[PDB]
Amino acid sequence: TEPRIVATYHIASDAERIEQRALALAIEQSVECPLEAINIVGRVEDVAELQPGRYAVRIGLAAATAPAEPGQLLNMLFGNSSIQPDIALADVELPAHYLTAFGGPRVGLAGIRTLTGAQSRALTASALKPQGLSPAALASIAHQLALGGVDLIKDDHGLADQAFSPFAERAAAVGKAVREANAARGGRTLYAPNISGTLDDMRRQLGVIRDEGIGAVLVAPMIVGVSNFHAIVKEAAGLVVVAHPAMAGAAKIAAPLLLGRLFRLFGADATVFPNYGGRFAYSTASCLALAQAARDPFGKLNACIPTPAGGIMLQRVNELLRFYGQDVMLLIRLTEQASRFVNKVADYGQRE
Amino acid sequence: TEPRIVATYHIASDAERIEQRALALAIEQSVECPLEAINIVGRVEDVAELQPGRYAVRIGLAAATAPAEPGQLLNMLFGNSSIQPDIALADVELPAHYLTAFGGPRVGLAGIRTLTGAQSRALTASALKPQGLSPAALASIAHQLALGGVDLIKDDHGLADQAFSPFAERAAAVGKAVREANAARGGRTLYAPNISGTLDDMRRQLGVIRDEGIGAVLVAPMIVGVSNFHAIVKEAAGLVVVAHPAMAKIAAPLLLGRLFRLFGADATVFPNYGFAYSTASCLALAQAARDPFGKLNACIPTPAGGIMLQRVNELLRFYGQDVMLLIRLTEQASRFVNKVADYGQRE
């Protein structure tokens, strides 16, 4: 008897129709047949009331149907049900063999700490914006940020391979600028350029990263396909792999499960998400759960650093470090103001 | 002045906050900067009240930010905003150069008609289920379906490369069985096996399809990444490319109809109103798939649902005959196929 995947879904339904709805869900994410058309059919393990009108439903899905293949796993978890308006995928309990197969973060929270020199303090990141800029202007900005002691500099997630500032030219100009800053200040700032397109495009761009001696990379798994994201993770070669959540909301998969657990499972070393109280609508509950899914014990897998983003000002730093603890990377006269932020973070939870 | 992409979004907002929300939208899908941090910024071209609490917002996005690269285009259209709960992407008006570059369906509605032998009638499809059967048992089902004159046989979208029926073994067994059936009844039934995994996995599986002489392929673009779906379309070599909506808030007509078509889908599967799709949405999806769209071929809308013998005439009145309805197996199959063939002709 092979152990099942237990997926938890949240369903908007009545008490009258919830039992029926749950069975239909088991079918939809299994054989997708009437029973008359027929170990493989999904089992309704449990139905619980979260509150009136909203249920949690545990479904046992035959592992046979979903090999350790990211796309196919997602397919069996939520492929068809994603089209329904009354359902969200909330959590997934995978058999241990899935965790070993996928392998999780290759560098992880501990690895990034070592690379950046952040022993115990929280880390800092910034993005290169706006995307209209030439690689030189982007480079100049990166230089100022890195001069300020920021741990990780990432591309705007919108930056890809535009004539504006083609990937090759941008990675060179920026990576060069970050190195120079590191040398002058004795820094260990990382740069994560955004790789894009087909798997062919992504590997070519990874080629440039490696050739330029760049130490990190940014990828939006839900854009490029999780199966390809995972493939790149396996080719990353000690690079810090930073995941971005672009298009993660297109289907109703809960953020903590997706950006936290699944992204981590597939190989993300850091994972970007909109902080509560930022421009987006994540609850504090969700942000905390996301952080925990990224960090907490999960088989033998490395932790992934939660990387919150939003209106993160000098005034928010202590709040966020109280909220998240110090195992977090906060994403926010440039060099001066950057140093201000960096020093505020470093000073957290130590003697005045 | 290069023409902009004009994306239309639907927003849940009040009259007091809508103008502001619209501006923030324009920024979010553009520079994603405060203005203090800086023709790239998105332009709010128009704001209109659909119903109280619901606005349609037209945003002019600089084409330079979104090359003709499927993933990146989706990125700039809705990457970030897909995270927000108050917005949906409803339509997109692309500069003609986008249509030319992507190329649309290589076979199209006309081409599938020719391959299938369906001159003017609606077409028919069925899926191989349940998942978990051996390649031989799947093959046997395929044979019975094809014997009934069904135009296209697709893998269950859930079928991939599982141990119980590996892609190579399934494609061979099922492809053979469909050919047999064809030779026996003088048929032209197509088989579309589901390809998946990484782009490497997809090309290997595509290689098996071509080696087996199979005439179609099934792909879920939102699973495999639209950029890779489009890469496969360019390698499909005259195979009918059938899109499946697995993992598809982008409005269904825009995504399954227009965008899938744009990227190269020759047929597009979607849940019929008869899931939660409205009749309005199903009709619009059909139209997005079929109607004039630059010089691009039409993509055949392929509705799926509890489509029964008693539903055929309804659905053909609804969609017209440029449609492929998805749904003693041979006797009951033949009965569906003949019903479809008989629609809108003299008794």
PDB file of N, CA and C in Angstrom, chain B residues 95-143:
ATOM      1  N   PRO B  95      -0.582  45.477 -30.765  1.00  0.00           N
ATOM      2  CA  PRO B  95      -0.060  45.931 -32.057  1.00  0.00           C
ATOM      3  C   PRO B  95       0.110  44.755 -33.015  1.00  0.00           C
ATOM      4  N   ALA B  96      -0.183  44.985 -34.292  1.00  0.00           N
ATOM      5  CA  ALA B  96      -0.135  43.942 -35.305  1.00  0.00           C
ATOM      6  C   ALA B  96       1.190  43.198 -35.328  1.00  0.00           C
ATOM      7  N   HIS B  97       2.280  43.880 -35.001  1.00  0.00           N
ATOM      8  CA  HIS B  97       3.567  43.203 -35.057  1.00  0.00           C
ATOM      9  C   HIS B  97       3.635  42.027 -34.077  1.00  0.00           C
ATOM     10  N   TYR B  98       2.835  42.072 -33.012  1.00  0.00           N
ATOM     11  CA  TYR B  98       2.775  40.950 -32.075  1.00  0.00           C
ATOM     12  C   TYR B  98       2.122  39.734 -32.721  1.00  0.00           C
ATOM     13  N   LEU B  99       1.013  39.957 -33.418  1.00  0.00           N
ATOM     14  CA  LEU B  99       0.334  38.850 -34.071  1.00  0.00           C
ATOM     15  C   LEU B  99       1.246  38.188 -35.094  1.00  0.00           C
ATOM     16  N   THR B 100       2.012  38.991 -35.816  1.00  0.00           N
ATOM     17  CA  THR B 100       2.842  38.451 -36.882  1.00  0.00           C
ATOM     18  C   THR B 100       3.961  37.598 -36.305  1.00  0.00           C
ATOM     19  N   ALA B 101       4.555  38.087 -35.223  1.00  0.00           N
ATOM     20  CA  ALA B 101       5.678  37.413 -34.589  1.00  0.00           C
ATOM     21  C   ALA B 101       5.280  36.075 -33.969  1.00  0.00           C
ATOM     22  N   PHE B 102       4.170  36.057 -33.231  1.00  0.00           N
ATOM     23  CA  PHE B 102       3.707  34.827 -32.583  1.00  0.00           C
ATOM     24  C   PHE B 102       3.165  33.820 -33.606  1.00  0.00           C
ATOM     25  N   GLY B 103       2.376  34.295 -34.571  1.00  0.00           N
ATOM     26  CA  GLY B 103       2.007  33.479 -35.719  1.00  0.00           C
ATOM     27  C   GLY B 103       0.694  32.704 -35.663  1.00  0.00           C
ATOM     28  N   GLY B 104       0.117  32.570 -34.474  1.00  0.00           N
ATOM     29  CA  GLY B 104      -1.157  31.898 -34.328  1.00  0.00           C
ATOM     30  C   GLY B 104      -1.127  30.425 -34.693  1.00  0.00           C
ATOM     31  N   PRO B 105      -2.311  29.824 -34.866  1.00  0.00           N
ATOM     32  CA  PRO B 105      -2.429  28.389 -35.142  1.00  0.00           C
ATOM     33  C   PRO B 105      -1.823  28.029 -36.486  1.00  0.00           C
ATOM     34  N   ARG B 106      -0.951  27.025 -36.510  1.00  0.00           N
ATOM     35  CA  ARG B 106      -0.319  26.630 -37.773  1.00  0.00           C
ATOM     36  C   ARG B 106      -1.242  25.753 -38.632  1.00  0.00           C
ATOM     37  N   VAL B 107      -2.174  25.050 -37.995  1.00  0.00           N
ATOM     38  CA  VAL B 107      -3.111  24.185 -38.711  1.00  0.00           C
ATOM     39  C   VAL B 107      -4.478  24.854 -38.753  1.00  0.00           C
ATOM     40  N   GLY B 108      -4.980  25.221 -37.578  1.00  0.00           N
ATOM     41  CA  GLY B 108      -6.210  25.985 -37.486  1.00  0.00           C
ATOM     42  C   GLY B 108      -7.489  25.209 -37.769  1.00  0.00           C
ATOM     43  N   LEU B 109      -8.605  25.917 -37.652  1.00  0.00           N
ATOM     44  CA  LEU B 109      -9.921  25.351 -37.880  1.00  0.00           C
ATOM     45  C   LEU B 109     -10.014  24.723 -39.281  1.00  0.00           C
ATOM     46  N   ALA B 110      -9.529  25.439 -40.286  1.00  0.00           N
ATOM     47  CA  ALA B 110      -9.570  24.936 -41.659  1.00  0.00           C
ATOM     48  C   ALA B 110      -8.749  23.655 -41.821  1.00  0.00           C
ATOM     49  N   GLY B 111      -7.558  23.645 -41.226  1.00  0.00           N
ATOM     50  CA  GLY B 111      -6.641  22.521 -41.321  1.00  0.00           C
ATOM     51  C   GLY B 111      -7.109  21.263 -40.617  1.00  0.00           C
ATOM     52  N   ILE B 112      -7.678  21.421 -39.426  1.00  0.00           N
ATOM     53  CA  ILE B 112      -8.270  20.291 -38.723  1.00  0.00           C
ATOM     54  C   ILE B 112      -9.447  19.716 -39.519  1.00  0.00           C
ATOM     55  N   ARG B 113     -10.261  20.583 -40.120  1.00  0.00           N
ATOM     56  CA  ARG B 113     -11.362  20.112 -40.969  1.00  0.00           C
ATOM     57  C   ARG B 113     -10.831  19.194 -42.061  1.00  0.00           C
ATOM     58  N   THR B 114      -9.780  19.641 -42.734  1.00  0.00           N
ATOM     59  CA  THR B 114      -9.186  18.870 -43.818  1.00  0.00           C
ATOM     60  C   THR B 114      -8.640  17.538 -43.318  1.00  0.00           C
ATOM     61  N   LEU B 115      -7.921  17.564 -42.197  1.00  0.00           N
ATOM     62  CA  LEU B 115      -7.320  16.348 -41.658  1.00  0.00           C
ATOM     63  C   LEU B 115      -8.361  15.342 -41.180  1.00  0.00           C
ATOM     64  N   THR B 116      -9.514  15.852 -40.777  1.00  0.00           N
ATOM     65  CA  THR B 116     -10.519  15.055 -40.111  1.00  0.00           C
ATOM     66  C   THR B 116     -11.546  14.544 -41.121  1.00  0.00           C
ATOM     67  N   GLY B 117     -11.732  15.308 -42.192  1.00  0.00           N
ATOM     68  CA  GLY B 117     -12.753  14.999 -43.187  1.00  0.00           C
ATOM     69  C   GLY B 117     -14.082  15.652 -42.848  1.00  0.00           C
ATOM     70  N   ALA B 118     -14.075  16.561 -41.878  1.00  0.00           N
ATOM     71  CA  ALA B 118     -15.302  17.266 -41.519  1.00  0.00           C
ATOM     72  C   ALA B 118     -15.411  18.551 -42.327  1.00  0.00           C
ATOM     73  N   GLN B 119     -16.100  18.480 -43.467  1.00  0.00           N
ATOM     74  CA  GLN B 119     -16.152  19.612 -44.389  1.00  0.00           C
ATOM     75  C   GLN B 119     -16.874  20.830 -43.813  1.00  0.00           C
ATOM     76  N   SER B 120     -18.053  20.629 -43.238  1.00  0.00           N
ATOM     77  CA  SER B 120     -18.840  21.750 -42.738  1.00  0.00           C
ATOM     78  C   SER B 120     -19.490  21.457 -41.394  1.00  0.00           C
ATOM     79  N   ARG B 121     -19.738  20.180 -41.113  1.00  0.00           N
ATOM     80  CA  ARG B 121     -20.332  19.773 -39.844  1.00  0.00           C
ATOM     81  C   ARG B 121     -19.453  20.135 -38.656  1.00  0.00           C
ATOM     82  N   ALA B 122     -20.043  20.147 -37.468  1.00  0.00           N
ATOM     83  CA  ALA B 122     -19.263  20.276 -36.240  1.00  0.00           C
ATOM     84  C   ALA B 122     -18.416  19.020 -36.102  1.00  0.00           C
ATOM     85  N   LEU B 123     -17.371  19.093 -35.290  1.00  0.00           N
ATOM     86  CA  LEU B 123     -16.521  17.935 -35.038  1.00  0.00           C
ATOM     87  C   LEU B 123     -16.800  17.356 -33.649  1.00  0.00           C
ATOM     88  N   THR B 124     -16.218  16.190 -33.378  1.00  0.00           N
ATOM     89  CA  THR B 124     -16.409  15.469 -32.121  1.00  0.00           C
ATOM     90  C   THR B 124     -15.079  15.027 -31.524  1.00  0.00           C
ATOM     91  N   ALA B 125     -15.019  15.004 -30.194  1.00  0.00           N
ATOM     92  CA  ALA B 125     -13.841  14.529 -29.488  1.00  0.00           C
ATOM     93  C   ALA B 125     -14.245  13.707 -28.282  1.00  0.00           C
ATOM     94  N   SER B 126     -13.330  12.867 -27.825  1.00  0.00           N
ATOM     95  CA  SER B 126     -13.498  12.193 -26.549  1.00  0.00           C
ATOM     96  C   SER B 126     -12.139  12.026 -25.880  1.00  0.00           C
ATOM     97  N   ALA B 127     -12.153  11.797 -24.574  1.00  0.00           N
ATOM     98  CA  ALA B 127     -10.912  11.642 -23.832  1.00  0.00           C
ATOM     99  C   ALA B 127     -10.738  10.212 -23.333  1.00  0.00           C
ATOM    100  N   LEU B 128      -9.482   9.792 -23.223  1.00  0.00           N
ATOM    101  CA  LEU B 128      -9.140   8.488 -22.669  1.00  0.00           C
ATOM    102  C   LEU B 128      -9.044   8.578 -21.144  1.00  0.00           C
ATOM    103  N   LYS B 129      -9.913   7.828 -20.479  1.00  0.00           N
ATOM    104  CA  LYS B 129     -10.001   7.769 -19.029  1.00  0.00           C
ATOM    105  C   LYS B 129     -10.518   6.381 -18.694  1.00  0.00           C
ATOM    106  N   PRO B 130     -10.336   5.942 -17.442  1.00  0.00           N
ATOM    107  CA  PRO B 130      -9.642   6.689 -16.393  1.00  0.00           C
ATOM    108  C   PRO B 130      -8.132   6.497 -16.441  1.00  0.00           C
ATOM    109  N   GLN B 131      -7.423   7.490 -15.926  1.00  0.00           N
ATOM    110  CA  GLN B 131      -6.000   7.395 -15.703  1.00  0.00           C
ATOM    111  C   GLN B 131      -5.755   6.196 -14.791  1.00  0.00           C
ATOM    112  N   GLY B 132      -4.669   5.470 -15.026  1.00  0.00           N
ATOM    113  CA  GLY B 132      -4.358   4.310 -14.208  1.00  0.00           C
ATOM    114  C   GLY B 132      -4.513   3.005 -14.965  1.00  0.00           C
ATOM    115  N   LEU B 133      -5.136   3.078 -16.137  1.00  0.00           N
ATOM    116  CA  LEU B 133      -5.253   1.924 -17.023  1.00  0.00           C
ATOM    117  C   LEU B 133      -3.922   1.692 -17.718  1.00  0.00           C
ATOM    118  N   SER B 134      -3.687   0.464 -18.161  1.00  0.00           N
ATOM    119  CA  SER B 134      -2.481   0.165 -18.917  1.00  0.00           C
ATOM    120  C   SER B 134      -2.614   0.764 -20.308  1.00  0.00           C
ATOM    121  N   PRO B 135      -1.480   0.961 -20.991  1.00  0.00           N
ATOM    122  CA  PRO B 135      -1.490   1.419 -22.385  1.00  0.00           C
ATOM    123  C   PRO B 135      -2.403   0.571 -23.270  1.00  0.00           C
ATOM    124  N   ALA B 136      -2.459  -0.733 -23.009  1.00  0.00           N
ATOM    125  CA  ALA B 136      -3.289  -1.616 -23.821  1.00  0.00           C
ATOM    126  C   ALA B 136      -4.780  -1.364 -23.599  1.00  0.00           C
ATOM    127  N   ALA B 137      -5.173  -1.201 -22.339  1.00  0.00           N
ATOM    128  CA  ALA B 137      -6.567  -0.924 -22.021  1.00  0.00           C
ATOM    129  C   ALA B 137      -7.000   0.452 -22.532  1.00  0.00           C
ATOM    130  N   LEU B 138      -6.085   1.423 -22.484  1.00  0.00           N
ATOM    131  CA  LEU B 138      -6.327   2.744 -23.067  1.00  0.00           C
ATOM    132  C   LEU B 138      -6.468   2.602 -24.580  1.00  0.00           C
ATOM    133  N   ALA B 139      -5.528   1.871 -25.173  1.00  0.00           N
ATOM    134  CA  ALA B 139      -5.551   1.593 -26.609  1.00  0.00           C
ATOM    135  C   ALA B 139      -6.883   0.995 -27.067  1.00  0.00           C
ATOM    136  N   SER B 140      -7.409   0.055 -26.287  1.00  0.00           N
ATOM    137  CA  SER B 140      -8.667  -0.617 -26.617  1.00  0.00           C
ATOM    138  C   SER B 140      -9.833   0.367 -26.616  1.00  0.00           C
ATOM    139  N   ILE B 141      -9.826   1.279 -25.649  1.00  0.00           N
ATOM    140  CA  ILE B 141     -10.839   2.326 -25.569  1.00  0.00           C
ATOM    141  C   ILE B 141     -10.752   3.225 -26.788  1.00  0.00           C
ATOM    142  N   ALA B 142      -9.531   3.644 -27.110  1.00  0.00           N
ATOM    143  CA  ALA B 142      -9.281   4.470 -28.285  1.00  0.00           C
ATOM    144  C   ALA B 142      -9.827   3.828 -29.547  1.00  0.00           C
ATOM    145  N   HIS B 143      -9.651   2.515 -29.661  1.00  0.00           N
ATOM    146  CA  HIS B 143     -10.102   1.769 -30.835  1.00  0.00           C
ATOM    147  C   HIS B 143     -11.625   1.855 -30.974  1.00  0.00           C
TER     148      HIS B 143
END
